[PDB]
Each structure stands twice: as C-alpha cells, then as structure tokens.
RNA sequence: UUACAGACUUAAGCAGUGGAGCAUGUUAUUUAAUUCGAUAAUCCACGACUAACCUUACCAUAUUUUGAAUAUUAUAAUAAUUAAAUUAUUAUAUUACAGGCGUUACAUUGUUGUCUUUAGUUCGUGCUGCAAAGUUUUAGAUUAAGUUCAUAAACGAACAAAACUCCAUAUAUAUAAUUUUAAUUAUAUAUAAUUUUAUAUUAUUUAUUAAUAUAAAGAAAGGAAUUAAGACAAAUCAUAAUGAUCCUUAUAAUAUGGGUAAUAGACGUGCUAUAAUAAAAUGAUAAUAAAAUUAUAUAAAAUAUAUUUAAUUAUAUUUAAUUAA
C-alpha cells in the first residue's frame, strides 16, 4: 500500500472549493487592493479556502477595474524641459463576496485572514446587517463651543450691550 | 522551560549544548542588564570538553569578553578575505529572495492542509432574519489594519413598501424624505458620518428613522396628499448614467432556423 | 479518496489526525476537484507538508513576516553563521565544474602540458619533467591607434630537454607579461626540434650562417672547452644540450634574430658524419675517438 | 510557467523597498517616509567599536519593508568580516562579539529591543530579520558599499594592479550557454515526466456521461510520481549563478577620472532558446541585472562606486 | 543616534558622518583656517 | 585628398510663423530692489506643474547672536538605580562650532542636453611576416533598412547588440449568485505572425533563387523600453551632496512693508481676430466619447437674486449621495 494522501492535502493542489449560495443574503464585501496582482491573487485564493472550512459561501475573486496613476517628470535637474520621463502606478482590485453567514462566523474569517495577511495587500470590508425598523436602546462641535466662549469674552460683550 | 535561562542555579545537570544555549539566551535577553553569575560560570566550566576550550580560558572569556579573546588570540590581524574565491556554497541574494517566496508558499500550503480544516469546528447554521421583520439594512465599513476616517460612516437603506405604512402615511413619508427616496427603486437611503464612532452614527440614523416614521404616521394636521411626489433629483441621476433599455423584437425571432440536435448512435449506445 | 483512521494513523502524526478527520467530514467523497490555471497555490511537486524542511521552510525560531512566535520568544541568539545552509549535498556546483579549492598550485608548465596534450597529443609528463624553459627577450611593444597607444608584452622563450631537443616560442599579451610567457612557452613546445650533436656535446665542424642581418660564426670545440659565445646563444645551447662551442656574431646583434638564426643554423647548416658518409659512399673516421679505442 | 511558479521568477512586489498598500493615502506616505528614516538610522548602527583601534564595520543592504495588514517586517542583508577572533578554536562560544550584541537588540533584548521602539513609531507590530551573506559579491548593494568605504586605499591612487586582478578572479568563468541549456533540459524532463504520468494514469482508467464533463485525472500520488522536494525545487531555481560583474569608479581619486572594470556576462540565454520570457523590474531594469551605486568622500571630494551584477 | 548611547550602554556605536565633520574641523584648525571666535553679547 | 553610398536637404501638400490687439518669456533700460540662472544649434510658457502675504533667493526698516546639529564641562528640576551618593530625562549655561541661494560646473558625485557609429569591441586558439603588426576573399550580394544571405587562413566564445520581450490587437479558459451592470464589461492565464501557400511573368550568381502580378488561408495592420564608445573640460554648486576659499554682531536668523508685475526700442513663443465652403441663436421621453479626479474632498436636486413666464448664465442659501465599476 502506497502512502495515503488525504483530501485536505489533495485540496491544496486544486482550485479552492466554493459552497452553494442558498438564500442570497449578502453579508459582507471584502475588497482587496495591491500595487501588484501576484500577491493579491494568491491571498484571494487563500481567503476562499478559509471561508469554505468555516462554512461561508463565497464568490469571486471578481476583478475590478485597475486604477492607473501617472506622473510626467523632466529628466534633467535644472533645465531641458523637452525630454520628459513617464511614471505610473497601477492599483489592482479584487472583490470577494460572502453570503448567508452569521456575524460571528464572518468575524472569524476576517480575524484569521488578518492574522495571515501578505505584504503589500490592503483590505476594505463592508458589512451588511439586516435589522428591524424599531430597535431597543438604538444601534457640540469644537468650533461652536469656542464661538460661545468668544461671544462671552469682554472684547465681545462690551459691544453686545444694548 | 521559558524561564530556565533566568535560573542558572538549575542549569547543573543539563547537556553541554543546552547550557551554552542558555548562557547565550541570558546574554541576549538581558544585554546591558547582564551581570556575571557564579552558577553560570560553574556550568560553563563543565562544557570545557564539549568545546575543547581550556578551563582557564573559559574563566577569562567569561569575565573579559571580546577583548579577552583578542588577547588569547595574541593579535587582532586576521587576513582580509573580502574577495576570496566563491566555493559554490551560498546563494545570491536575488536567489535567496525566490527561496523566501517559496518558503511563504509552503507556509500557506501547510496552513491550508492542516490548520484551515480545524476551522470547521466553528461552523454555525445560518439563522436567517425574516425578510419582513428585518427590512432595514445597516452597512458598516472597516479598513483592516488602518486608521481611516470613512470607517465611521454608517449607511441605512430600506424599501419604503416594507415599512408597514398606510397609503396616506407612505405618501407623506416619501414626500418628507425628498432626495433620499428613489421612486424607481423604492429605496430610502440615508448615511451619516457626523460622529467619530460607527455605533454613534448608527444610533443617529436609527433615531432619525423613528422620527420620520412618527411624523409620517401622524396625519392629524397635514397629510401632504395635495403635494405630488417630486422626482427631479432622480431624473438628474438617471441622465448621468447610460440606459440600455432595448430588447430584441419578439416578432423577429425565427425558432425554426435554430440548429436541430443530430442523432449520435455512439452516445446513444454508450448510455445503455 | 477517504481513508479509515487506522490507515491514516500509521503514516501521519497524531497531531495532524484531527485535521484529517474534520476534512473528511466536510469535503464530500464525490467532490470533483478542478485545476486552477490562473493561480498556482500548491508547489510544482508532491508534498504532504508534515515535516518542516530545514532549508525550503522558514527556520523555527527565526523572525520573519509569517513568524508565529511572539517577539519575545525567538530562539536565534547567535548571528555569526548562515542560519539555513544549502540543502542536500550543501553545494550548487554546476555539473561539469570543479570547486577552486587550490589556487597557486597551478603550474604554467602543467597548464601548457595539459592544453598541448589535448591539442597536439604530446605527452604531459615529458613537458612537465624533462623540459626546461628560459626566457630570452621580454619587452613591451606598442601600437598607435586612434583611441591611443595600446601597449603589449612580448616574450621570446627557449625550451629544451638538454639532450638534443630544443624549441623556440614567442608570445604576445596586452594584459600581463606572465600571459605572454605562457603563450611563448606554449609556442616553444610546439616548435620543438632535434638538432644533430657531435658526441652529444658540440656541433659538426664550423658554421657560417646568415639569418637576415645576423652573421653567425660558430666553431666546434674540444671536450671541456665550455660555451664561449653570445649570451643569447649560450642559453639556447644550454637547453639544447650543447656543452662546448665558440663563436662570434657580426653585423646585427638583435637578440630575437640571433635566437632564431641559431636554431635555424643548428638544423639547416649541420651534417652528421653518417649523412656525409652515405651521400659520398665513403668512410669517415674520428681520429681522436679511434686513438682511444681497443 | 516561469511567472506562475515562485521559484522561477521574482515577484514584482520585491522590486519596491516599501511593500505596502493603505486605503488612507496619507498613512501610506507616512509609512514610506518612516521607512527611509529607519533605513538611514540602521546604517548608522552598523559601525561598532570595541577599542580605539578595533572598529568593526558591518555592511548592510537597503531594507525591505514588508507591510502586511497586521505587522511590519524589516528584512535586510548584512555582511560582517569577523577579524577579531577568526580562529579554529571555540572561544567564540563563551562571549558575544559586537556583531552578536548588535543583532540581539533588534528582537531579543527584553527591555529595549529596537522592535518595540519602532512598534510605537509605526503603531503596529514590527519584526527585524537580519540575513547574513558570507560573500560581498552576492548583493550589488553590499558590494558597492564595501568598495566605496573599505577599498579606498586601493583605488585612491589609481586601481592597484592586484586589486583589479582580485576583482576579476572572484568567480570562475562559467559557460552561460551550457548552464542555460542544462536548465532548459531539466524543465523539459520535469514537464515530460508529468505528461507521461497522466497519459499512463488515463490509459489505465485510474459513468460515461460524467466522462465528458469532469477533468479529475486521479490520485495525486500518481500524477506527481517521482516529483518530490529532493529533485524538483533546486533544479528550477533561477538567478543561481553569477555570470557577470562590472565595477566602475569615478570622481577625484586636479580632475575627475573614471575607471571601468567589466568581466563576464550581461545577458540571459534562458529567454532566447525557450518560451520563458524576461521581466523588467520597475519597467526599466532587466530582472537578471542588479545595479547599485555608493558614493563616499575623500580629500578631493565625492567619488562614486557603480557595481552591476548579472545573476542567471 | 544620540539616544543610542543610553538605550544600549553596552554597545559603542560610531557616527561616521559626525566623525568626518570633526576631522575636517581639526584639519582646518591646523592650517590656520579655523573659525573666528564668536563675539559675546555681553561685550 | 579620390570615388561610391547614405542620409542631410529640396520638392509637393496642409496649417502656420513673420503684419494688428492682447498673454507670456527674454533683452535693454530703469529702480532702494526690479533675486538668480539658462541664454546658436542644445536659452527665450526654460528652471517655474500656478510670485498678492507665504513662496523668496532681492530692497528698506527693526530685531536675534552656540543659533537646527554633535560632543564636552558645570548648574539645576525630575524619575529610577544604588546605600545620601550614582544613573535617566529636561532646561539653562559653556566652546569647539552650527549656519551661509557666499565664490568656483574649467576641481567634483549624480543627472541631463547634443551628436556619431555598432556587425560593434575584446578574449581564446590557429595562421602570415625577422618584427612592430596583420588575419587577408571584400570596395561580396541583397533589403527601405542588419534587411537577408553567401564567402575567405581562419574557427570559435563573450558581450555590443538585434532579439527575447511588455503593450496594443484577435481568440480561448477562469472569475461575477449580470442591482457596484459597462457581460457591448472588468482582469488573471494561455495562444497567435518576423504571416503562409501555390501559380504565371521578369531578371539572376538560373538554383533548393529574387522582383512582380495572380488565386487561396488568416483578425493580423502599430508601438514600446533600454543601452556600446567618444566629443562638446556643453547645462546644473539654485533639486540635494563634496573639496578648496571667504563671512562669523553677519555674507547667518526673524518680523513688517516693498520688489520680482517698472517701460523707449528689439527678439522668442502663444491666444483672439480681420464674415457667408462661416459666424450667431435654438434643439427635454435629453444624438454620440474617452481618460481622469473626489478624507489637506467632489458637490446633486431644490430655493433666492441678477430677472423677465420659464429656460440659459453667474452667485448666494442649503449640503442629497459618495471616499467610490
Ligand atoms: K589572434
Ligand atoms: K510682491
Ligand atoms: K465670422
Ligand atoms: Mg450626508
Ligand atoms: Mg444639472
Ligand atoms: Mg456615475
Ligand atoms: Mg517677507
Ligand atoms: Mg514676496
Ligand atoms: Mg561649514
Ligand atoms: Mg542668504
Ligand atoms: Mg554658467
Ligand atoms: Mg614568426
Ligand atoms: Mg449588463
Ligand atoms: Mg519673473
Ligand atoms: Mg464671435
Ligand atoms: Mg444622451
Ligand atoms: Mg444645481
């Protein structure tokens, strides 16, 4: 008998598994951004594997439009504004959506993937919580205070006198 | 034990290399707060054979330091082997970066093989909130590992027809919402980032919702039934987007021209 | 495939069995795994990931981006050695390359002997043991170019076994004089020639040879006479195995042309007694040698 | 293949010394500014002295600042020539040399480790991983700094004939073509070993309807038979052999003079004979080439050392 | 760098940039090209 | 100094420059100052991707003197350490200094402008000449062109390169529960061409060939990056950095105001216009884009005034949504 390779090890060599969406209740939107795609894609694949074992139906990574920033410089330090060099930066974006999951399990996903994050990858998470119209116990500016103080000071009260 | 390096009295009886490892840990962890200890020196003298260092030198090295060793050496002039020939025993720094990449991959592979499966113990069945008792949706935002001002922003969105308002009260609700109501989609959406914490902003939107609902359900003085709904704000938004509202004419469809599935005996025979 | 705990417990460590059991209860046996052609998560080889490789995995206790220990629980307190030595044999020596362990033990004579054996078939042992090399001319020459004066090293050497075989070699190098001598030593061995010697000590009679502007007058000498000739000729005679010789150089005394002229004279201007006898059909007797014969 | 494997290409993230993305652009600018300042500070912590006549200069490369969501790892390569106790004895096992003392304050010191100080400057967990390089010509940055700062007495009155000779016998002149062709043969062999494994696993049959949709070929072991960590990894690793190096000098060493030393290969043939494709780092530097410049000040003034290494 | 001499008393760090400046100051003093003594406000 | 080739030029074509007004840079002159460069090609909307203050480097007046740094030595205030002394921090003081857009790009680092040529250079071996050297056919053929090919006592190797490549384009797979919708899309991976094929003709070094046409197949038609050497001791010490030399109650530092916006002539570069193949109004189920931007914000709709039914334009009031497919 050869050495048995269990399903957990085999899964690592194949595309991440996805759980079917039953109801379609969008619970979270995780957008990942990086200046390079390679770590972004690898990390996105890891998130899908983490969610599967947690029981979270996940979709994506959906590629969002890449943003391009551009800067044009003059190569010479002092004069010669006729030769200009071009520079650019590309923001790569990916969207992973979570469905039909309880808030506690969703927080476990975010905690785990935060602990094992990759270099140069940023993450924004929009959480969607469906609530009742009427809740129990619910869910002054600095400038204004100074104005009141100033209008009580003698340099201002001396005029307001009617 | 973790604290063993702090108890040189307990080092007696440990193997030679373990004592040296505990001697090196006490120096690294204490640094400028390191003071020679007799027990520590006694244990190190027991390793004079594992290292073949004269028992006398150990004592000097233990009290003098690098200077002591330089004296034992007899000089401080060691050949400058900075351009020595390559012995094909180390990798270039650029190849060591590709090995680091592979060390990271294997680290993640190992987590996915043996650590992620353990997360299945925490699976919880989805306790779906009834779509009718929970019509309001609060969107929260979190920028992980960052301080971002927008993290405070909270958004509230609900379908006006799911608020349980009568016909006249529903009309008053939509009139008072003004630009916050989209008749096309029937969505009433209001966001607030005025406060510093999202919890504060969530309550603020909740309180406004209760106030708007109370006013809309109090039709004792005015019901605003004469006032028609104003959609000018929605029209302006629609003009800024492109509308592909054209479909293929149904009377142009020719279903009789579609390809007809052919008979394949092999597939028909392979199924039996 | 799903395996019973018994089988899996005989190959994988106990600490990893719980993960395998949970994975075999969450992934249905009828899962049709698909291959990803965008992202390569797994390595290009098979690995159970049950053992930490000392090189291909992060070193336990070393700080790094994915280190799981707390910052106060690292176990690397010595920094004088490379933490992760190369795997396997411990080297990456390319196939067909040798570690330069010894340098300076290389001998220019042995480098000439190896190269010449591969290029011409001459025996390395003879070159490295039987031959003696003596530089004769070592100077710097220059060529005037548009970029500027390009200097070159010129070396003229003589090699011989002191037993009749002698050769002259020339070499040029723009880098260093040692390279010019190596090329000259290489050239000299290829030009090795045998020279007739009377009684293996001197030449047959007298030679008056003209090589370009050099007039060479060489006279044979009695046993024990020694070499009384131009210094350039002296060195060649030493390598060739000539012990007794007299002579004078007239007109041009250019060292380079004296050496070449001498070698040419020793071959083209000599005739053995045996060759003279056979051509003329006569017996030639060495009176001095017969006087001391039985 | 080359860009789809972590062992055959350099991740583009490594082309930048600060590897970060923050939604808050201001915080990203601040982190970038903090990384330059800490890099300068670390350069000032590399020169150590035991006694007036024992000054040990550690040559440090530029820092690689890996900013993840939860922590910052500051990775740098360093070279140290141990000249105080370079013996065959084990006396170094009973005291901490100055370089070990310096490396132990990065993370090990329990009271004043540099990581905790930096953790407050960055407001995140910080780790420092020093990596020791045993030769000075394995990193272009370290090589330039050594020459610029330590070999001045060799090129301040022209490049010594011995100094240049040492800089030309550092590496044996490997034949780049056979090494390039050996690498391509190994790839073909590995590629042909997996195709044969599947062809056999299919011809041996490891629902006819399901035999037209699924692509699962069979057991992982059979598909990857004879492809293990002991033969695949080390044969596909790239940039493993130094095949070329050029060291330039310039400045005043009363007029500036420039001397250029060029020795070896400045190209890669793995990209010509095979479908593997080259990548440009920062979109202008070839990947095989690593170039760095280091300047210093002498009696006359500023002089620059420009080193370029070609690793294939 | 000035805080390193108290954070890590055991280690002796050398500031090459500062050291270079001090050497240039001594050199100019020896050539007579030093800096004039600064006038005191009391005067 | 010869011949050939190459571009360089010229031609043709479209719209301009040179003329008017204005904008802008420069010169000259003026001024307490009108800061300083750059200033033929290779300066002149250049440095400068914004001079009211600031910026600022200039001028007038007033004011500061170890100054922003490091170290030394004192003095204190403070916290720890150690049995009141020590050490930490902070402030003050002390003196070496700090500081300098002061001079020197013709003393420098780095960067850049301008040009040339790359089958370019070196290395190894072989061969020719006594040798310095040469490496020979060849002043080859061919292409728009290293374009492609052939050849010689030369044969290789290395770089220089070309290319490989990345981009665009075409197609395939994957991803999106097609309400973040643009699926007519987004972005990862891979494929594709340096096109191929036959046919007749015309030349040839006629052969296993070129130039053409012709039919056939194909989405296939464009770009990029970087350097090899050398010259102008070309620009920059005003992006920052270095030596020398000079200032140190001032050539350093701060504040208020002024100047850099002056105006005879001259020059560069732009804008607007001199009317009918062309200008002006109006066009609401709203003809038709792309690429960017919005936490040191982008600002909807509405209302009010100019202002007239309304629209349009400008501003105010108010501040919806979005920190974003
Ligand atoms: K030659
Ligand atoms: K002004
Ligand atoms: K008109
Ligand atoms: Mg709002
Ligand atoms: Mg509008
Ligand atoms: Mg829009
Ligand atoms: Mg001012
Ligand atoms: Mg001003
Ligand atoms: Mg100074
Ligand atoms: Mg000034
Ligand atoms: Mg000038
Ligand atoms: Mg000859
Ligand atoms: Mg659509
Ligand atoms: Mg101006
Ligand atoms: Mg008009
Ligand atoms: Mg429209
Ligand atoms: Mg409006």
Swiss-Prot record, chain A:
**Keyword match Iron:** no
Pfam families membership = Ribosomal_S10
Question: InterPro entries under this entry?
Answer: Ribosomal_uS10, Ribosomal_uS10_dom, Ribosomal_uS10_dom_sf
Task: Indicate the transmembrane segments per the record.
Answer: none
Transit peptide among keywords? yes
Under Gene3D superfamilies, the record lists: Ribosomal protein S10 domain (3.30.70.600)
* Residue stretches in coiled coil: none
Q: What family does this chain come from, according to its entry?
A: Belongs to the universal ribosomal protein uS10 family.
What HAMAP family does the database record attribute to this sequence? Answer: Ribosomal_uS10 (MF_00508)
Q: What does this protein do?
A: Component of the mitochondrial ribosome (mitoribosome), a dedicated translation machinery responsible for the synthesis of mitochondrial genome-encoded proteins, including at least some of the essential transmembrane subunits of the mitochondrial respiratory chain. The mitoribosomes are attached to the mitochondrial inner membrane and translation products are cotranslationally integrated into the membrane.
Q: What is this protein called?
A: Small ribosomal subunit protein uS10m
Lineage, broadest ranks: Eukaryota, Fungi, Dikarya, Ascomycota, Saccharomycotina
Curated annotation (Swiss-Prot), chain B:
Query: Where does it live in the cell?
Result: Mitochondrion
User: Does the keyword section mention Acyltransferase?
Assistant: no
Q: One GO molecular function term?
A: structural constituent of ribosome
The primary gene name is RSM24
Cellular component GO terms, alphabetical: mitochondrial inner membrane; mitochondrial small ribosomal subunit; mitochondrion
Primary role: Component of the mitochondrial ribosome (mitoribosome), a dedicated translation machinery responsible for the synthesis of mitochondrial genome-encoded proteins, including at least some of the essential transmembrane subunits of the mitochondrial respiratory chain. The mitoribosomes are attached to the mitochondrial inner membrane and translation products are cotranslationally integrated into the membrane.
From which residue to which does the signal peptide run?
Answer: none
Which domain of life does the protein's organism represent? Eukaryota
A GO biological process this protein is involved in? mitochondrial translation
Key words, A-Z = Mitochondrion, Ribonucleoprotein, Ribosomal protein, Transit peptide
User: Where does this chain mainly localize?
Assistant: mitochondrion
InterPro entries, alphabetically? Answer: Ribosomal_mS35 (IPR017081), Ribosomal_mS35_mit (IPR019349), Ribosomal_mS35_mt (IPR039848)
Which family is this protein grouped under?
A: Belongs to the mitochondrion-specific ribosomal protein mS35 family.
Organism ancestry: Eukaryota, Fungi, Dikarya, Ascomycota, Saccharomycotina
| Name assigned to this protein | Small ribosomal subunit protein mS35
Q: Does the keyword Ribonucleoprotein apply?
A: yes
Q: How does it assemble?
A: Component of the mitochondrial small ribosomal subunit (mt-SSU). Mature yeast 74S mitochondrial ribosomes consist of a small (37S) and a large (54S) subunit. The 37S small subunit contains a 15S ribosomal RNA (15S mt-rRNA) and 34 different proteins. The 54S large subunit contains a 21S rRNA (21S mt-rRNA) and 46 different proteins.
Curated annotation (Swiss-Prot), chain C:
Q: Which domain of life is it from?
A: Eukaryota
Location(s) in or outside the cell: Mitochondrion
Looking up Pfam families in the UniProt record yields: Ribosomal_S5, Ribosomal_S5_C
Q: Name one GO cellular component term.
A: mitochondrion
Q: Does the keyword Nucleotide-binding apply?
A: no
Question: Which residues does UniProt call coiled coil?
Answer: none
Alphabetized Gene3D superfamilies for the sequence = 3.30.160.20, 3.30.230.10
Principal subcellular localisation of the protein:
mitochondrion
Question: What keywords were assigned to this record?
Answer: Mitochondrion, Ribonucleoprotein, Ribosomal protein, Transit peptide
Q: Which GO terms describe its molecular function?
A: RNA binding; structural constituent of ribosome
Q: Where is the S5 DRBM domain?
A: 131-195
Q: Which InterPro entries match?
A: Ribosomal_Su5_D2-typ_SF, Ribosomal_uS5, Ribosomal_uS5_C, Ribosomal_uS5_N, Ribosomal_uS5_N_CS, Ribsml_uS5_D2-typ_fold_subgr
Q: Does the keyword DNA-binding apply?
A: no
GO annotation terms (biological process)? mitochondrial translation; translation
Checking PROSITE patterns in the record gives: RIBOSOMAL_S5 (PS00585), S5_DSRBD (PS50881)
Report further notes: Present with 6680 molecules/cell in log phase SD medium.
Main function: Component of the mitochondrial ribosome (mitoribosome), a dedicated translation machinery responsible for the synthesis of mitochondrial genome-encoded proteins, including at least some of the essential transmembrane subunits of the mitochondrial respiratory chain. The mitoribosomes are attached to the mitochondrial inner membrane and translation products are cotranslationally integrated into the membrane.
UniProt similarity note: Belongs to the universal ribosomal protein uS5 family.
Protein name per the record = Small ribosomal subunit protein uS5m
From which organism does this entry originate? Saccharomyces cerevisiae (strain ATCC 204508 / S288c) (Baker's yeast)
Q: What is the lineage of its organism?
A: Eukaryota, Fungi, Dikarya, Ascomycota, Saccharomycotina
Gene that produces this protein = MRPS5
From Swiss-Prot, chain E:
Q: Per the annotation, which location comes first and is thus the protein's main one?
A: mitochondrion
Q: Keywords assigned by UniProt? A: Mitochondrion, Ribonucleoprotein, Ribosomal protein
- Is Ribonucleoprotein among this UniProt entry's keywords? yes
Q: Any S-S bridges, and between which cysteines?
A: none
Q: Write out the GO cellular component annotations.
A: mitochondrial inner membrane; mitochondrial small ribosomal subunit; mitochondrion
Gene Ontology BP annotations: mitochondrial translation
Family listed:
Belongs to the mitochondrion-specific ribosomal protein mS33 family.
Free-text function comment from the UniProt entry: Component of the mitochondrial ribosome (mitoribosome), a dedicated translation machinery responsible for the synthesis of mitochondrial genome-encoded proteins, including at least some of the essential transmembrane subunits of the mitochondrial respiratory chain. The mitoribosomes are attached to the mitochondrial inner membrane and translation products are cotranslationally integrated into the membrane.
- Please give the name of this protein: Small ribosomal subunit protein mS33
Q: What is the lineage of its organism?
A: Eukaryota, Fungi, Dikarya, Ascomycota, Saccharomycotina
This protein's encoding gene: RSM27
């Amino acid at each position: 008998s050869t050495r048995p390779y269990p399903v957990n090890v085999e899964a690592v060599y194949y595309a991440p598994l996805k759980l079917p969406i039953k109801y379609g209740d969008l619970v979270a939107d995780i957008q990942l951004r990086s200046y390079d795609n390679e770590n972004l894609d690898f990390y996105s694949d890891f998130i899908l594997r983490t969610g599967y074992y947690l029981g979270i139906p996940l979709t994506g990574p959906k590629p969002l439009p890449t943003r391009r920033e551009r800067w044009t410089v003059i190569k010479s330090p002092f004069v010669h504004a006729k030769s200009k060099e071009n520079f650019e930066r590309h923001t790569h974006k990916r969207l992973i959506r979570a469905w039909d999951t309880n808030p506690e399990v969703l927080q476990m996903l975010i905690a785990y993937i935060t602990k094992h994050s990759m270099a140069g990858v940023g993450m924004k998470c929009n959480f969607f919580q469906r609530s009742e119209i009427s809740l129990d116990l619910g869910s002054t500016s600095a400038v204004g205070q100074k104005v009141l103080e100033l209008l009580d000071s003698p340099d201002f009260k001396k005029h307001l006198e009617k | 034990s973790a604290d063993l390096y702090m108890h040189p009295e307990k080092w007696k009886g440990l193997p030679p290399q373990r004592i040296l490892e505990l001697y090196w840990e006490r120096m690294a962890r204490l640094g400028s707060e390191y003071k020679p200890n007799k027990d520590e020196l006694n244990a190190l003298l027991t390793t004079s054979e594992y290292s073949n260092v004269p028992v006398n030198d150990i004592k000097k090295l233990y009290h003098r330091g690098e200077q002591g060793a330089i004296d034992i050496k007899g000089g401080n002039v060691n050949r400058d082997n900075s351009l020595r020939p390559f012995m094909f025993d180390e990798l270039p720094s650029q190849a060591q970066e590709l090995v680091a990449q592979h060390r990271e991959q294997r680290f993640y592979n190992r987590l996915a093989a043996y650590e992620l499966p353990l997360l299945a113990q925490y699976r919880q069945e989805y306790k779906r909130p009834s779509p009718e008792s929970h019509p309001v949706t609060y969107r929260y935002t979190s920028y992980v590992g960052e301080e971002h001002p927008n993290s405070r922003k909270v958004v509230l969105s609900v379908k006006t027809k799911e608020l349980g308002l009568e016909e006249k009260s529903l009309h008053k609700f939509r009139i008072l919402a003004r630009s916050r109501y989209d008749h096309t989609t029937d969505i009433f959406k209001m966001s607030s980032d005025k406060f510093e914490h999202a919890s504060q902003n969530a309550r603020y939107l909740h309180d406004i919702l209760q106030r708007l609902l109370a006013e809309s359900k109090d039709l004792t003085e005015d019901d605003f039934s004469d006032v028609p709904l104003d959609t000018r704000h929605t029209i302006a938004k629609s003009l800024r987007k492109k509308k592909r509202d054209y479909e293929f004419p149904e009377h142009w469809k020719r279903p009789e021209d579609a390809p007809k599935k052919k008979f394949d005996i092999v597939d028909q025979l392979l199924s039996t | 495939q799903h395996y019973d705990e018994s089988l899996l417990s005989r190959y994988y460590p106990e600490s990893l069995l719980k993960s395998i059991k949970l994975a075999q209860q969450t992934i249905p046996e009828d899962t049709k795994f698909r291959v990803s052609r965008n992202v390569e998560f797994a390595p290009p080889y098979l690995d159970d990931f049950t053992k930490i490789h000392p090189f291909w995995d992060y070193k336990p206790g070393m700080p790094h981006l994915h280190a799981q220990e707390e910052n106060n629980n690292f176990s690397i307190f010595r920094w004088d050695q490379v933490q992760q030595p190369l795997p396997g044999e411990g080297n990456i020596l390319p196939p067909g390359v040798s570690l330069p362990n010894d340098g300076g033990r290389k001998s220019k004579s042995a480098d000439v002997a190896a190269g010449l054996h591969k290029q011409t078939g001459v025996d390395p042992d003879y070159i490295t043991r039987k031959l003696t090399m003596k530089p004769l001319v070592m100077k710097r020459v220059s060529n005037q170019t548009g970029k500027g004066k390009i200097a070159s090293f010129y070396a003229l050497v003589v090699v011989g076994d002191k037993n009749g075989m002698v050769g002259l070699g020339e070499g040029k190098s723009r880098e260093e004089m040692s390279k010019a001598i190596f090329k000259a030593h290489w050239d000299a061995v290829r030009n090795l020639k045998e020279i007739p010697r009377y009684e293996n000590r001197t030449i047959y009679g007298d030679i008056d040879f003209r090589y370009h502007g050099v007039k060479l007058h060489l006279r044979s000498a009695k046993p024990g006479f020694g070499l009384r000739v131009n210094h350039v000729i002296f060195e060649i005679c030493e390598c060739a195995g000539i012990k007794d010789l007299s002579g004078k150089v007239y007109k041009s005394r250019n060292d380079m042309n004296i050496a070449k002229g001498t070698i040419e004279a020793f071959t083209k201007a000599q005739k053995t007694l045996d060759e003279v006898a056979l051509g003329r059909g006569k017996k030639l007797v060495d009176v001095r040698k017969v006087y001391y014969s039985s | 293949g080359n860009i789809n494997n972590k062992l055959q290409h350099l991740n583009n993230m490594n082309n930048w010394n600060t590897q970060i993305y923050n939604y808050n652009k201001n915080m990203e600018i601040m982190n970038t500014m903090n990384d330059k300042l800490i890099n300068k500070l670390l350069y000032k912590m590399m020169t150590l002295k035991l006694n007036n006549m024992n000054i040990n200069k550690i040559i440090m490369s530029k820092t690689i600042n890996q900013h993840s969501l939860n922590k910052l790892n500051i990775k740098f390569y360093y070279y140290n020539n141990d000249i105080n106790n370079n013996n065959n004895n084990n006396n170094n096992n009973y005291y901490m040399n100055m370089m070990n003392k310096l490396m132990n304050i990065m993370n090990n010191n329990m009271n004043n480790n540099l990581c905790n100080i930096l953790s407050y400057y960055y407001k995140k967990k910080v780790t420092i991983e020093p990596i020791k390089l045993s030769y000075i010509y394995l990193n272009s940055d370290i090589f330039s700094k050594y020459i610029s700062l330590n070999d001045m007495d060799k090129y301040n009155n022209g490049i010594l004939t011995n100094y240049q000779r040492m800089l030309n016998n550092i590496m044996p002149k490997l034949n780049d073509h056979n090494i390039s062709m050996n690498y391509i043969n190994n790839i073909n062999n590995i590629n042909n070993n997996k195709y044969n494994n599947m062809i056999n696993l299919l011809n041996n049959n490891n629902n006819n309807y399901n035999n037209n949709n699924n692509n699962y070929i069979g057991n992982i072991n059979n598909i990857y038979n004879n492809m293990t960590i002991d033969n695949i990894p080390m044969d596909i690793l790239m940039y493993k052999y130094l095949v070329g190096w050029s060291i330039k000098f310039k400045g005043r060493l009363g007029r500036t003079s420039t001397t250029n030393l060029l020795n070896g290969t400045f190209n890669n043939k793995k990209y010509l004979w095979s479908n593997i494709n080259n990548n440009y780092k920062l979109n202008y530097i070839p990947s095989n080439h690593n170039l760095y410049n280091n300047s210093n000040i002498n009696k006359n003034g500023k002089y620059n050392i420009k080193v370029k290494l070609n690793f294939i | 760098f000035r805080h390193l001499k108290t954070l890590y008393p055991d280690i002796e760090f050398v500031d090459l940039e500062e050291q270079y400046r001090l050497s240039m100051v001594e050199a100019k003093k020896r050539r007579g090209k030093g800096a004039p003594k600064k006038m005191k406000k009391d005067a």
